[PDB]
Every structure is written in C-alpha cells, then in structure tokens.
RNA sequence: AAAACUUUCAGCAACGGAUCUCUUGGCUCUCGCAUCGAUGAAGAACGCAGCGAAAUGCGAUACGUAAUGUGAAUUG
RNA sequence: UUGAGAAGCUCAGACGAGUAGGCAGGCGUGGAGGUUUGUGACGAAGCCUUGGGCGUGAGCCUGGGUCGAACAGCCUCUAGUGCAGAUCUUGGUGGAAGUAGCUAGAUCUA
RNA sequence: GUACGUGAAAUUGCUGAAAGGGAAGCAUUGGAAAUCAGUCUUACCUGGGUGAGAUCAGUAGUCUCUCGAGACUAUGCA
C-alpha cells in the first residue's frame, strides 16, 4: 500500500503520465534487467537501455534472440534489435520491435557517464 | 409419479405479433376498453394462479429430477444424497477443462447432468 | 560428436555429426553419413551395447557381432551365431556386458552367457515372462530381471566373496540363488491390485553381507517409476507416477549424477530424486524414442521420427539430424567434437 | 448458543448456503444430507456425527459441545470397516445413546458412500472414452485455412490431368474400355 | 471476399464484384434480373441490342411508371425501358468475369451466368441510390452416362 | 495511428491511398508502354516476378522424398506391414467398417454412402463393451485387413481411426465438412463397379506411410468399365476424399485437346491426421509414430504430410 | 392452380450502428497556495516550423538562444 | 418414521369477476460492503438461433453458432432502476416512387 | 482490410421451400412435411476356484493427538 499524498493511485493519472511521459522520462521508463553474471559482479539489477546494448530476447516469438540494439524508439516504447526482423510482402525486412522489459542486457555498451552510473548505484567495477 | 403440466404454451402479450416494438414478454393489459382484459370469446389467455402447477412436480424435468446449476466439482458432490431428485446443469460460462472432470465426478456420483456433452468430442 | 546407429533393415550408419547441426535448416552442415552392414529386415539391429571401444551388435536372428570403432570403416572383428532353436518363439529383450561375459537373456527367461576370449556359452533358466533385466556394474554376478506380471527379483551368483569373484567360476546355475524379490505395493484406493509390469532396470546405487542394499530403480507399463532398496525392504522405497503412457527406457545421466525415463509418448525428462520430483524435459523430439545412450555430457536420443537428437546435461538441442531410415538404437562413441 | 448460531447463520447469511429454488443447500463438508435445514446444519448443531471419505476409506466423524471452542480438536474420527455390516454396527456403537435421527442420517450416507466408491471402482476397470476439449480457436483456423487449402487444391482440375496423364501411359490394356472410339483416335495419333 | 451465393469456390467459378457504383438500384435490379441465368456469350448481345436499342429490359417489379413497349413479348411483359448507364456497368462487370474465367482456365464456351445480385450501396433531398453488384460465371453443369 | 481525430485521420488516408492508386497507375502505364515496345523487357519480368504461394513458400523439411529412386526407401517398403498388398501376393483388402457405441441414424448414412466407395467391405454395429483392441484380433482370426472404426457424438461424425490388420499401424484422423451425395449439386448414383484410386501431393516420408495405407484400401484391379475414381488429394496437410463418375471428351484447354466431364458421386469429406500410431490403437498406451502439434500447425507454410 | 406477381418462413449478401467491453474525458468533494499591467498586460493580427492534416510551440536569436541537470538520442 | 430452514412439517373445510382505491409477496437493471477457498483465452460479456428445459407470470437456466476480456449466484446497502404511445427527443430506414417532375437526344428515349 | 473491435432492430437484394377468388390477421384442436429432445442391461444376489492385501495377524516399530484414536513402516496372507 501507498501511504504518501503526494503519489496518485489513480488509473487515470498513472495511464496519462506513463502514455503523455516526456523523452527525458521515457528514458527510466524503458529500463531492462542484467543478466546475472552482470547483476551479480556490477551490484546492479536493472539499467536503462542504450543503443550499442547487447541483449537476449526473453519473451515473445523471438524468445532466445540476441543482438545489439541499433536504436530505441521511445514514441513507441521499442527496441530495435539487429538480425530481429520480419519479413514484408515486397521481402523487405520490417524490424521488430521489442519492449525493454521483455530484454536481458548480457554485455553492457560502458561509457564514462554510466561508470558513473554504477558507483552512484551502490555498484562496482 | 408422473409431471402433469396444466399448460405448456407460453402467455405472449396482446398484440406483441403485430408489432416489432412490442416484445413477447408477459404484460398485463391496463387498458380499461381492452377485449382481452375483460376475457371475451376469442381473446387470449392471460397469466392466472389457476395455471399454477402441482407443488410436488414443481420444477420438475419430464425425465422427473429437478434442475442444479453446477460451476466446479465442489458443486456436484452436494448432490451425492439428492442423486434421484436432482440433475447437474453445468453452466454456461465453464470452461470444457472444468466440464470433463464435472462430468466424470458426476459418474461415480450417479448424478445425471443435462448437458454433459457439450464443447467436448470423444476419443474411444 | 561420433555416434553409431542401427535400423530395421540391419544397417549401421556411422553419423559424423557435429555441434549446432540441425537437418531441418537448410543452412546446416549435413553429417558425413558412413553407412554399412545389411539391407534385409529379417536380421534388423535389436541392442548396440557399447563394450569400452568396442560395440557389441545384436540382430533379430540371433547374429550378434561385435565391430570395433577404433578405426574407419569398423571391421566385424567377432561374429556368433544363437541357436535358433531357442528363438521360435522368444525374442532378445536385453543384451547386456560385465567382467568379459555377455548376457542375451531372452523374453522366455532363458540367459545366455557367453566369455568373450574363452568363447564359452552357459545357460540359465529363470523366471516368466521377462521384459527388462539388467546387470550390476561395479559387483559381479549380479542379475536384476523382471517382467510383466513378474515383480523384479534379484539374482546373485557371488554370495558375498567380499572383493570380487573370478570370471571363470562365474554363472553358474547351481550358484545363484535369489537374493531378494519384489513385493507389490498395497491395493489402490478402489480396492484394485496395482498391476506389475517391469519395463526397465536400473541400479541407482551410483547417484544416490559386503555391497549390500542394492539400490535401483524400476520403470513399469503403467507409467510408475519406483525406487527400491534390499535393505529397507521388499516394497519400494517410493513410488512415483511420472507418466500415463507406458515407460520404455530409464538409465543414469553421469553428468549431473541423475536419472531419466522416457515413455512411449515421446517425451523423456529427467527425475530428480533428492526433490522427489522431474525436473525439466528434453524439447523437440517427436516420435516414440526407440533407444537412449548417454556418454558424458551429450545424450542422444533416437525414435519414430527417424531423426537423431542429440542435447546435453542440460536439454539443450546441441544437435539434430535425419537418418531416412527407421532407427531402433543408438550409441554415442565420441563424446568431443569432430574437429578436435 | 444453538438456537443462538442457527438463528445467525440459518436466517441471515451463512457462506456455506446455495439458494436454489425448490430447496437451499449446504456447502459444508460436515453436513450429512447436503441440504440447509435446522438438524443437518453441522454450524448449529453442537453434537453432530457425520461420515465422509478419505482416499477411498470412509470415517465417522463426530463432534461434541464440550469441544466446541477449539477448532483443531473439535472433531473426532474413527474408521468405519469395509465390511458394510461391521460399518453399521460401528455407527451403532460410537453413536450410542445420541438421537435416532442422527444415527439414521449417518447410515444413510455411508450407503451412498459406499456405493459411490463401488461405481468408482467399477468405473476404473471399464474402458470409457477420453472426452478431449473443443477449442475455438483452433476450429477458426483450421476452418479458414482449410477452405484456402480446397480453393488452392483445385481437385477437379488436378484430377482430370492425372486422369489424362494416365491415359496418355496405357494403364489399361490395348485400347481403353472408358473411351469413344473417336477419342481414342484422338490420342492415338497426338501420342504418335 | 465472400459472394451471397454458396458458389464461387474455385471449382468453375469467375467472381466479378463493383462497389458503390453510381448507378440507380432500382434501375440496376432489372438489368440483374433479366441477364440471370443466361449464357455468358449471349449475355454480350444482348447488352449490345440495348445500347443500340434493338432489345429492351422488361421492368417487373419497379414496373411503375415504365410505358408500354412491343419489345417486351420475348420475356412475356410489355412494361420495358432502354436503360444504358446501367447496362454500361454490367457490360463492364461481365468482361472483368469473362477475363477472370480466362486467367482461371476455364472452358469459355460453356460459361452461364449462374448468380448475379445487386444490393443498396450507402445513400448519398437528393440522396440517390448507388448498387451493390456481384456477378459468378459458371459452367454448365453436365451428366455423364453410369455404366452403358 | 499518429491522428486521434477519426474523420481527419479518414481523410488524411484517403488522400494517400489515392496517391498510392495514381503513382503506380503512372508506373505501370509506363511500364507497359515501354515493355510493349521491347518484348524483352516483358518476358523476362514475367519469368522474374512470379507470384509466390504458400506451396512455393513452403518451409524446408528434409524428409520430403526426391524423384530419383534411392535403395534404401524402397528397401524399407519391401517387408513393412503394408507389403502383402504390393508384392507379388497380391491380398485382397478386406475391410471392415465399424462405428462407436450407440451411433445415431446419421452415422449410418455416412457409412452406407462410405460402403459404397468401398467394395468388399461390410459394415457391423459395435454392439456392448467391446474395444478397438479386441475388435483387430477377433477381426483378424476372421480374414480382415483393415479396420475402420467411425467415431460420432451428437448426431454427427467427427473422427475416423483406420488400423492395419494384424499389428499394422493404426491412423487417427478427424473428418469435417461430411456431405453425403443428395447434398452434392449435380451428383450421380454409384455403380457396383471398383473405383479407380488417385493419391496426390503426399511428398513427405510420413506422406508415404498414409498414402500407402490409403492405397492399401482399394482393390489394385479396377473396373475400367465402370470408369469411376476415388480420389485422395493431400493440400496442406488436409486429405480431401472425394468419388467421381469421368467420362474423356473434347475439351479446349489442354494442349492436347481431351478433358474428361466428372459427376461427383459422394460422400464428400476432408481427413487432418492427428495421430499415427505403431501398432493397432490403443490411445492410452500406444507407440506415437505421429502426434499433431496445434502450436506448430499455427506456422501456414509448415505441412507433415 | 406452375411461371410471373403477392404473401410467409429460412439461408446468404447488403444497410445501419444498437448492444457489450474500455476510456490520457467530464462531474463532484476535499486540501495547499497567492502570482497581471506604461519595465507595455489580457486580447487581436501577422510571421517562423525542410514537410508536417490541423493543433501545438516560438518571435526576424522565430516548434527557440544562454546556463544547469540527465547522458545518446531524433523518428511519420 | 427419521417429516425441527418451528421462518419447518402436517391435517381439514370453504372459497375464487372486478374499475377507483387498499394490502402482500416476488422478477429485472447500474453501483457498494460481505460471501461463493466463485466462472473465464481449454473463451468473460454481448449478440444470433424452427435446439432443449424451468416458472401462473415478471423472468431464469442451457445446447449450437458468432465473438474476444472480463463476469456472476447468495445476504445486505444504494439509486439518474424497467416504456408502445407524450402531433415525445436524437439517429437510422421504408411505402408513396423511379412517381411529381427537371438536363439532353429523337410527345418518345436517355 | 483504414466503408476497419463486437455488429442488434427497422429496411433491401438473391436463393430455397410453402401458400395464394377482393386483406393479412391471432387463438383452440389435430393432420401432413421438416426438425428436435430421448432415453436402453447393468446391475444386484448367491456361489466355487485361483491368487491378491488391511481396517485380518496365537505379529514387531515410528509419528501426531489422547490407555486408544488416526497416519504410516517391516513381516506374514493361516
């Protein structure tokens, strides 16, 4: 339960802030767990994704897929992960696209900013 | 004992045949210059007490067991002592998962179900 | 991996496969097929025991060969021919191998013996209808048969002999005697007899009077597995219902030190005993499984679907093909890869 | 207390109770007849004596006032004998002196337990066929893909080819016993 | 998609369909009607004859306001008109059905006009009409002799 | 799906999807025009851009046989439980139609007309509590080769399992779409003469097994007088049965000018085989050969037999 | 009397948008707060978006610049 | 003799039109508390049906088809709770009618 | 299939069946035609034989309640 009056547990108002969610927000909302190995040896559970992120498809009909994400389409809540396609009538490749949950990131694509990221999370290296 | 029933066509409301708007469902005529409320020759038969069967047989299937609806197997086992007055009726809404083992449960019972081949095939 | 397999028209096909091969992508490596022996069924392939690097070839006819994989193309380095007035009307349910003897027990109860260098054959009658007996690995003289309506009953030629006993004076007929029979558990909740019927054997002694309590495990045409023990008594320790459908084989996965049992359903998982219960199932084979061997982490498993599968420890599908002809066993001979 | 509980429970709302039209009936596990009623409501009955089966073993189970405030001890349980006469004369004795309604009641459940657990028995050694699920979704697609599948068959077209096809081959003997002789002529002389 | 008639499967069956076509359905009810059932090749001629006035189109049931003619005796009326826009919609619906016939293989020369239905398309005080066509073509359906 | 407004966002794709129609309208006139000038641009587009079909488009599987005759398949063929039929021995099919317990006036519709396909074949009420399993071995003492057992519930047939006498394998499948003759349009009336068989498109090695058990129903010397045909068309996965009356005639569209007029005969019905089974049918403990995935079947280009 | 025509019933196809399900909307109540403008407000007009259906944003620095923060997007 | 929902069970006799009006008990709808250790993607709700059943009736249960994500029985609480009419309101759709007629061609035809 | 979830009624077209001297029209009772529910012997009693096993042992243990009441285990199946 929550006791705080400055949270809502309104449908209303948690369906328009998760659906009217600027960029910046999105960013959080589109977060994926880490593999084990990397939850256990960075101290981390879950990051948000990036694009150059190596992932292992989870759920779905492309379950067991991996590849890196060439882009993250925050309109719509999606990956976008190399090799996942479907193919068209015409036989172009349409990708797929995957929510971030539905994810495990198995290599993560470090930058200083997100060695930052670890050791502010209670994390290693 | 044998289920007499008294009547066994429905009471359609007055002029319910004439007219779309105007369901079957039972209405009583509240005109005062209406033919069939004042019950002249040729009129309808209205909905009386006098029609109301024998308290016995009341409720009563033709094959003489009385109807019990049935959602789960917790239900057909109230009917291990009422297996010569009652019948199971599984639901509508119960899902062909649930209705094989009612019907099963049902057959060591002894228990009748009215419906008890419905969305199912048989694999001998 | 190198695995050796035989069919129903008698032909032995050495398959080449290797790691990641999968016939139904056309994109696979097709395995290098070396393909031998007859093309006749009235002398198809029965039991395909493995013999260290040897492979010991049992043949509806009673021809049983043995080849030897050491090299390519293997060369039938021994033949024997089993009397056929003793398959009229029987059949080889088994063929097993212990301390240079080789066993042929058949469905009447009849077990033959045979010495491998000394090429001296000893018979032995035993009980009814038999339809799995199995031999204990690390004690010889050691007889664990059962069948149907005959509950598994274990037969021992060296009482004790507290070490080992030599091959020579080995089965003997007026030398065993049954050290332990089967008792049938008590009747089902209906008042009904639990009907017997062994299916398969196996000494769980491995993963679980000197050498005693002899701890295997039994598999029944009723889809019960059961664990037994001599010592706690003649009724099985516990008794599971892992399947409806009739089981067909059970055996140890050496890797992970435990058990699995495949029924005629096509499906073979693997029984954690410590949890009482089974853990995981191998994925993707189709078809009644005809024969399983396991040699170190891989497994392959080969059925109706005239296919060859071949996973880990783990049901992970390292391998598949298709072998066109209706396979009945299969035996891995080389656990590592081709290349290595 | 009893007249206290039934009142409560008989009359205002009790969670073991289906209301059905002709009569209400009882979802407890420790009514004997199944039904709602004053002397067969286990709830407000403070000494009430019960059978029901374990496992294919029926019990007598009966339950006092004096143990009617802890819940875990509250009821007692015996084994009745698979012998039906032995069973009776066990209600008889564990049940003695309690009123001749309730002795009647419990023997009359143990008749219909002991009968349900005979048809159970006799069930298990019939063959009886499997009733397997229709779903329908499954029905959808495969009627669907099944019309695309006789559209893309085109049956009467691949038949007379093959019937043709084997003309042209002489399955039959010299000339063909299905065919006008000017037909024949036909496809002697396109053949050749 | 999926005509009023049980027909149509691929079996012999060419479909020609047109929708909201902006035509009169009242006046499109009667071409319907005539041309049902008839072959395909005299079908042609007898749309031709209208166009050229040679043959007319009894009006049977919205035979109001259709004056009497000495062309209708054929089909035992004498209510007929000579419409052309819409017997131009069935001339065009009937060579798309002949074409489809001719991809599908089909014997041409024994093509009838099994099933032909016009339906009221969505209105559009002007709110005219439009129609619904459909048209299968079919081949006649013969008898072989048992066994003499 | 950018447009919240419905009636914007239906003009907005009526405006495009008219775009669309005069863009390639504007492609394709020059494209003819231009093809119409060069043939070879025309003939080899058409050689290039043929259409794609859920045949052409079928997943890959290994187990489909190839033209060429190979040893070891027809070696197979040569002693299975099927072999009395093709050798030298030439054995009668005997067949022995039966339905499930308490079949309805229906069902027995279904049968006679099912009766007729099938000369030498004869029809017996399963009567009481005997099963599949006792029905094989006391029809086998009795000189029968298969078994055909219908399967109805609720007034109507559903299933239909065939077993091989003795030992032979056994085939579960599921009819739909049953039409007796009366219900066929432009029908005819059966003669006594046996039918001819035609089996087609059953590629797959399992295709063989069912095509060849098919087969093994129908006596291999047809009456050519009667000139009547049974056919047993496998199309994804579903057998259409379907009896005709043929009569060879002139036709326009062959090359060679003969087409033959076909009077169907009935009864009508498609077969989806859900389980092969080694052995005579036993549904609790029998040796799957086969067993029909729904999840797998969901895959529209992925056939089995 | 069969056809046509008319009527009735049913099947299929149209027509229509009921019903059901939901919903970034409304309505109501309660709570916190005090902040427009001659230093040019509210409003109106006209312009800038590479295209944006409008709508939104912005003001010739025109769907913004500076600074800070997050740290890799934008997206039809 | 088990027949104590004492609000139950049981026995007997008489009686039966009905406007205004009086009185009693029931059916159905939206939401709320409790309950059914309730039903549901193995198909909720809705709709369709010359399928079957129950009730004197309001109504209710169910098979088949269609369908696709929620829903119900029981005790109590609550109310924007039940339609054939209001020259009712909004929407859809008919007969009148291819008529009255108004744009071409030769009163006719389009 | 963007005329896009479900898709009622009024209304319209086609097809099939039936009816039809200036109305339909509903009720009551049956016929005819079509179409449904709608069901069955399968169990009881009495054996005998064979083996089976516990709630049976001229039997031994453990656990939970409270001697004996349930749950099991080993052995015998007289």
Redesign the interface.
């Known amino acids: 339960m929550k006791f705080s009056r400055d949270v809502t547990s309104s449908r209303r108002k948690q369906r328009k802030a998760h659906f009217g969610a600027p960029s910046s927000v999105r960013r959080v909302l589109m977060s994926a767990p880490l593999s084990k190995e990397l939850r256990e040896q960075y101290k981390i559970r879950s990051l948000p994704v990036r694009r150059d992120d190596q992932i292992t498809v989870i759920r779905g009909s492309n379950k067991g897929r991996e590849g890196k994400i060439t882009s993250v389409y925050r309109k719509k809540f999606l990956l976008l992960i190399e090799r996942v396609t479907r193919e068209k009538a015409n036989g172009a490749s349409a990708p797929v696209g995957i929510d971030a949950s539905k994810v495990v990131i198995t290599k993560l694509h470090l930058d200083k900013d997100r060695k930052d990221l670890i050791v502010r999370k209670g994390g290693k290296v | 004992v044998n289920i007499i029933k008294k009547r066994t066509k429905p009471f359609k409301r007055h002029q319910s045949d004439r007219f779309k708007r105007v369901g079957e469902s039972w209405r009583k005529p509240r005109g005062i210059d209406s033919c069939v409320r004042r019950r002249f020759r040729g009129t309808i038969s209205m909905p009386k007490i006098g029609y109301g069967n024998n308290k016995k047989t009341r409720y009563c299937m033709p094959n003489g067991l009385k109807a019990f609806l049935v959602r789960n197997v917790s239900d057909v086992e109230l009917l291990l002592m009422h297996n010569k007055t009652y019948a199971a009726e599984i639901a509508g809404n119960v899902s062909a998962r649930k209705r094989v083992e009612i019907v099963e449960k049902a057959r060591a019972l002894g228990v009748k179900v009215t419906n008890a081949g419905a969305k199912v095939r048989s694999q001998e | 991996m190198k695995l050796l397999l035989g069919d129903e028209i008698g032909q032995l096909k050495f398959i080449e496969i290797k790691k990641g091969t999968d016939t139904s992508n056309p994109e696979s490596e097709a395995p290098v097929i070396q393909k031998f022996g007859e093309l006749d069924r009235e002398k198809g392939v029965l039991f395909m025991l493995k013999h260290e690097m040897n492979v010991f070839v049992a043949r509806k006819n009673g021809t049983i060969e043995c080849w030897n994989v050491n090299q390519e193309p293997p060369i039938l380095s021994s033949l024997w021919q089993l009397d056929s007035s003793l398959l009229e009307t029987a059949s080889i349910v088994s063929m097993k191998y212990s301390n240079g003897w080789l066993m042929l027990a058949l469905s009447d109860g009849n077990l033959l013996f045979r010495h491998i260098e000394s090429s001296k054959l000893r018979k032995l009658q035993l009980h009814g209808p038999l339809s799995a007996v199995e031999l204990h690995p690390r004690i010889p003289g050691i007889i664990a048969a059962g069948g149907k309506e005959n509950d598994v009953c274990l037969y021992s030629c060296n009482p004790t002999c507290k070490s080992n006993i030599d091959e020579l004076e080995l089965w003997r007929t007026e030398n065993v005697v049954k050290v332990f029979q089967g008792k049938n558990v008590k009747n089902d909740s209906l008042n009904l007899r639990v009907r017997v019927w062994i299916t398969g054997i196996v000494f769980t002694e491995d993963i679980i009077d000197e050498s005693l309590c002899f701890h295997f495990a039994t598999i029944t045409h009723y889809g019960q597995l059961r664990f037994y023990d001599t010592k706690h008594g003649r009724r099985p320790v516990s008794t599971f219902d892992v399947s409806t459908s009739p089981l067909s084989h059970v055996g140890l996965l050496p890797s992970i030190k435990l058990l699995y049992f495949a029924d005629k359903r096509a499906q073979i998982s693997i029984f954690d005993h410590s949890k009482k219960k089974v853990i995981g199932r191998f994925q993707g084979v189709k078809g009644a499984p005809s024969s399983i061997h396991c040699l170190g982490n891989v497994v392959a498993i080969t059925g109706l679907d005239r296919n060859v599968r071949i996973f880990d420890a783990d049901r992970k599908p390292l391998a598949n093909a298709y072998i066109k002809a209706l396979p009945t066993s299969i035996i891995v001979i080389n656990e590592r890869d081709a290349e290595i | 207390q009893d007249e206290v509980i039934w009142q409560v429970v008989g009359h205002e709302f009790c969670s073991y109770r289906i209301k059905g039209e002709a009569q209400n009936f009882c979802r407890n596990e420790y009514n004997v007849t199944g039904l709602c009623n004053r002397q067969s409501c286990p709830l407000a009955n403070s000494r009430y004596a019960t059978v029901r089966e374990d496992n294919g073993k029926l019990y007598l189970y009966m339950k006092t006032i004096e143990r009617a405030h802890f819940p875990s001890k509250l009821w007692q349980r015996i084994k009745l004998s698979k012998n039906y006469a032995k069973a009776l004369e066990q209600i008889d004795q564990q049940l003695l002196y309690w009123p001749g309604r309730q002795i009647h009641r419990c023997k009359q459940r143990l008749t219909r337990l002991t009968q349900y657990l005979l048809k159970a028995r006799r069930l298990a050694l019939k063959h009886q066929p499997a009733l397997i699920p229709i779903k329908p979704k499954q029905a959808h697609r495969e009627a669907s893909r099944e019309r695309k599948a006789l559209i893309a068959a085109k049956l009467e077209k691949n038949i007379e080819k093959e019937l043709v096809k084997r003309l042209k081959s002489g399955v039959y003997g010299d000339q063909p016993l299905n065919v006008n002789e000017e037909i024949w002529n036909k496809v002697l002389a396109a053949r050749e | 998609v999926r005509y009023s008639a049980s027909p149509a499967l691929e079996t012999k069956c060419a479909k020609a369909r047109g929708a909201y076509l902006r035509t009169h359905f009242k006046n499109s009810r009667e071409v319907a009607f005539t041309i049902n059932g008839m072959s395909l090749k005299k079908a042609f001629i007898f749309l031709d004859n209208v166009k050229e006035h040679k043959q007319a189109v009894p009006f049977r049931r919205f035979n109001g306001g259709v004056g009497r003619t000495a062309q209708g005796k054929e089909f035992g009326v004498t209510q007929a008109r000579w419409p052309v826009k819409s017997v131009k919609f069935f001339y065009d619906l009937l060579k798309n059905a002949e074409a489809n016939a001719e991809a599908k293989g089909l014997d041409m020369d024994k093509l009838i006009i099994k099933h032909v239905q016009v339906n009221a398309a969505p209105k559009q005080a002007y709110l005219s009409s439009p129609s619904h066509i459909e048209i299968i073509v079919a081949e006649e359906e013969e008898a072989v002799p048992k066994a003499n | 799906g950018k447009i919240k407004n419905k009636i914007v966002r239906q003009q907005q794709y009526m405006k495009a999807l008219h775009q669309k129609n005069k863009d390639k309208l504007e492609r394709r006139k020059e494209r003819a025009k231009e093809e119409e000038k060069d043939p070879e641009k025309k003939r080899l587009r058409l050689s290039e851009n043929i259409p794609a079909?859920?045949?052409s488009k079928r997943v890959?599987?290994?187990?489909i046989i190839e033209d060429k005759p190979?040893?070891?398949?027809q070696?197979?063929l040569?002693?299975?439980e099927f072999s009395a039929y093709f050798s030298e021995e030439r054995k009668v099919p005997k067949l022995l139609v039966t339905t499930?317990?308490r079949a309805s006036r229906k069902c027995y519709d279904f049968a006679s007309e099912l009766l007729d396909c099938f000369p030498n074949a004869e029809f017996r009420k399963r009567t009481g509590?005997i099963?599949?399993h006792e029905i094989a071995e006391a029809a086998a003492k009795r000189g029968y080769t298969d078994l055909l057992?219908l399967?109805e519930?609720?007034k109507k047939t559903?299933?239909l399992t065939l077993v091989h006498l003795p030992n032979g394998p056994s085939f579960y499948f599921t009819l739909?779409?049953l039409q007796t003759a009366k219900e066929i349009?432009?029908h005819?009336?059966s003669?006594g003469?046996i039918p001819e068989l035609?089996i087609?498109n059953f590629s797959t090695?399992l295709g063989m097994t069912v095509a060849r058990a098919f087969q093994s129903l129908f006596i291999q010397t047809p009456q050519?007088?009667?000139?009547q045909?049974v056919?047993i068309?496998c199309?994804?996965?579903?057998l259409?049965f379907?009896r005709?009356?043929?009569?060879?005639?002139?036709?326009?569209?062959?090359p060679?000018?003969?087409?033959?007029?076909?009077?169907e005969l009935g009864p009508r019905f498609?077969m989806?085989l859900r389980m092969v089974q080694?052995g005579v049918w036993d549904?609790?403990?029998?040796?799957?050969?086969?067993?029909s995935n729904?999840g797998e079947e969901?895959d529209?280009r992925k056939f089995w037999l």
């Open positions: 079909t859920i045949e890959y599987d290994e187990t190979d040893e070891e398949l070696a197979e040569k002693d299975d499930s317990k509590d099963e599949v057992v399967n519930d609720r559903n299933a739909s779409n349009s432009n005819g009336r003669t003469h035609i087609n090695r050519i007088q009667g000139r045909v056919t068309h199309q994804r996965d579903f259409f379907r005709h009356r043929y009569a060879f005639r002139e036709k326009s569209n062959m060679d000018g003969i087409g033959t007029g076909l009077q498609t989806r080694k549904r609790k403990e029998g040796e799957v050969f086969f067993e729904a969901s529209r």
